[PDB]
Design a binder for this molecule. Structure first.
Ligand SMILES: [Cl-]
Ligand SMILES: [Cl-]
Lengths: 144, 144
């Protein structure tokens, strides 16, 4: 399903990383956030939904989506909580792997995360990349 | 050309907004940044390039791209400075228009910007939306 995303946080070096995975393609978007708050998650969601067609968001920590600030962002953006796992487990551990491998290519973690996001979305797997699959899946879906 | 982006900053309420426009489609990505520094622009660029195929970046303030931190991000990500304007002028003023119209739908400017980014990328113009045009242009280009 073209509009389903998975969202979780992961910790590294005393910092929080928010990771969103487009489930049908394995494409990721991540950000280093100051703290694991409702505000940060709501904000991230509103950004994601202006960039990709976000219909439903799945998470492995259900309580992350209970703040007033997260429901308000999902209400405004039209998002529902997905109620329907191999790809996501692979994508997150893979992310930390690439983070580990590019960590010395940058001073701060936040740069290293974006370098790993880039590496991950471009790597062909076969065999297209996740970034090629997500636009392929979205382009086909637009046209009926 | 599918990989050309335009980047500028704009000021509103004492704050800086970074606005990137995919030139062939009119699709936008924006962020409210703390300050107009080289670090912030480099970071934004590295994020953009892990999300969309960024080949060349055009700007209306050439000196924005002279810091060591911006050239390092463009060097790493493979980006060059575009050396080759109606769409972008329309897209930026339009952004402030929509920012003006949704400003009371949120407490902070940064939420309002993302609500305007969303509104802008989804609005059909005809007649597809910018978000539909950018994946159409990228999907076609992938396949030869
Ligand atoms: Cl750095
Ligand atoms: Cl707000």
């Amino acid at each position: 399903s073209p509009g389903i995303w998975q969202l979780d946080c992961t910790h590294l070096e005393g910092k929080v990383i928010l990771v969103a995975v487009h489930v049908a393609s394995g494409y990721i978007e991540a950000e280093v956030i100051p703290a694991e708050t409702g505000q940060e998650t709501a904000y991230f969601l509103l950004k994601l939904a202006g960039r990709w067609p976000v219909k439903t968001v799945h998470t492995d920590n259900g309580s992350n989506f209970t703040s007033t600030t997260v429901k308000a962002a999902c209400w405004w953006a039209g998002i529902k909580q997905e109620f329907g796992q191999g790809v996501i487990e692979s994508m997150n551990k893979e992310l930390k792997k690439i983070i580990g491998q590019v960590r010395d290519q940058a001073e701060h973690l936040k740069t290293a995360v974006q370098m790993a996001v880039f590496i991950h979305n471009k790597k062909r797997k076969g065999g297209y990349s996740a970034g090629e699959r997500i636009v392929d899946i979205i382009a086909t879906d637009i046209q009926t």
